[PDB]
């Protein structure tokens, strides 16, 4: 295979698709993520996008994911948050509906993900100090 | 060993050296990488530099090199890009000539690297499901 | 050649009269007109 091109899905192409199908197009969204009145407005918008990106990277850095898109955690998933089958959410539900369905608990979820990793971090520490 | 002075290679001093010789001068370039009209122009220049560094960091972050300077990849190197011996491409060629040699295949390499890392993460997720 | 990406299987609740794009366009047009009239000469001696 030498005379073929490379074509991927466009920006937000899998917005209405399933979770399993939209999980393979996160790279394009991640890459697209990044007279003086006009200059001040443009620089303010660019800088605002910069703190939003750094805030997202900082929120991911406090967890056990140092930059990877897909990553697993050690905290258990509370069944009381959704009480639904994994097969039907990953095969018959988009990301928009899933986002508005659990829009409340995400914040407190982030908090456990954070402290948990904190104690988890010192876990390897009191083991790595045994060397 | 109390009056020992430490000096390193200068900024871009390993440009004319070989690939192996310039491979140990990456940290210096990485650390050195970072009235209203004058302020807005200098601010725009600094913001552009920060955005360029952010884009490069994100480019290395989407791959399996989130932070490490030297990293490998399971995808192989096809001879269509450059069919040269390892004994002479690392000891008889600089970074400038080598970059100008395969400058037309950088986008293809970047695309295959990102899709390979995406499928690698999917395979790792499926492996952790056992 | 601007990119046009169709988004199927999704419905967005569009609502005009509240969008900020028209307000920003009005502000930008006013600002551009004011900056365009800046290098022109004032007409103060006509009041006679």
């Amino acid at each position, epitope marked *: 295979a030498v005379g073929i*091109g490379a*074509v*991927f899905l466009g920006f937000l192409g899998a917005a209405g698709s399933t979770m399993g199908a939209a999980s393979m197009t996160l790279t394009v969204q991640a890459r697209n993520l990044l007279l003086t009145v006009w200059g001040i407005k443009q620089l303010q918008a660019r800088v605002l996008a910069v703190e939003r990106y750094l805030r997202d990277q900082q929120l991911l850095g406090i967890w056990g994911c140092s930059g990877k898109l897909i990553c697993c955690t050690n905290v258990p998933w509370n069944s009381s948050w959704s009480n639904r089958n994994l097969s039907e959410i990953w095969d018959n539900m988009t990301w928009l509906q899933w986002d508005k369905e659990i829009s409340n608990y995400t914040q407190i979820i982030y908090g456990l993900l954070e402290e948990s990793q904190n104690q988890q971090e010192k876990n390897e520490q009191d083991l790595l100090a045994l060397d | 060993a109390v009056g020992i002075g430490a000096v390193f290679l200068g900024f871009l001093g390993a440009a004319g050296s070989t690939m192996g010789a310039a491979s140990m001068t990456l940290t210096v370039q990485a650390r050195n990488l970072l009235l209203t009209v004058w302020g807005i122009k200098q601010l725009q220049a600094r913001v552009l530099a920060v955005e360029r560094y952010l884009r490069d960091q994100q480019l290395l972050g989407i791959w399996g090199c989130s932070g490490k300077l030297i990293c490998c990849t399971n995808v192989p190197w096809n001879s269509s890009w450059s069919n040269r011996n390892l004994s002479e491409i690392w000891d008889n060629m600089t970074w400038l000539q080598w970059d100008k040699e395969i400058s037309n*295949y950088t*986008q293809i390499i970047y695309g295959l690297l990102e899709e390979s890392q995406n499928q690698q993460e999917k395979n790792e997720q499926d492996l952790l499901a056992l | 050649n601007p990119q046009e990406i169709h988004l199927e299987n999704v419905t967005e609740e569009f609502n005009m009269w509240k969008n900020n794009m028209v307000e920003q366009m009005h502000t930008d047009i006013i600002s551009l007109w004011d900056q365009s009239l800046k290098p022109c000469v004032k007409l103060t001696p006509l009041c006679v």
Partner: nanobody
Framework: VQLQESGPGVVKPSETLSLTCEVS??????????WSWIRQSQGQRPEWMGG????????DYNPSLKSRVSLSRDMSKKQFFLNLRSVTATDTAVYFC???????????????W
């Protein structure tokens, strides 16, 4: 995705032949397409002349046409040309503009002719 060749049907010998191929991209498949020109004579097997990518623009030509074929592209109007200098009597053939690109969404080849 549909392609359409265009150019002069009858040309005089010894000058440069110019052809243009209309390329219709997909709806939500932004990426890189590989455009190529393949000609086929009457009762003769087809032969690949040249190919090029839509992003970088690098071209690949046949080992017997370094001084005659010239590939060009323009993403503004989504059309790519073909310039064959020094046409001979053996150049009378049917020209086909093909597009090769792998679709990562459906794992298809989409070899449209």
């Amino acid at each position: 995705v549909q392609l359409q060749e265009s150019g002069p049907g009858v040309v005089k010998p010894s000058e440069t032949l110019s052809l243009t191929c209309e390329v219709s991209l997909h709806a939500s498949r932004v990426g890189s397409y590989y455009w190529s020109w393949i000609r086929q004579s009457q009762g003769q097997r087809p032969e690949w002349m040249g190919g090029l990518y839509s992003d970088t623009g690098n071209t690949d030509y046949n080992p017997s046409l370094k001084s005659r074929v010239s590939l060009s592209r323009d993403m503004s109007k989504k059309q790519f040309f073909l310039n064959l200098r020094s046409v001979t009597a053996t150049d009378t053939a049917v020209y086909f503009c093909v597009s090769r690109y792998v679709d990562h969404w459906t794992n298809r080849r989409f070899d449209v002719w």
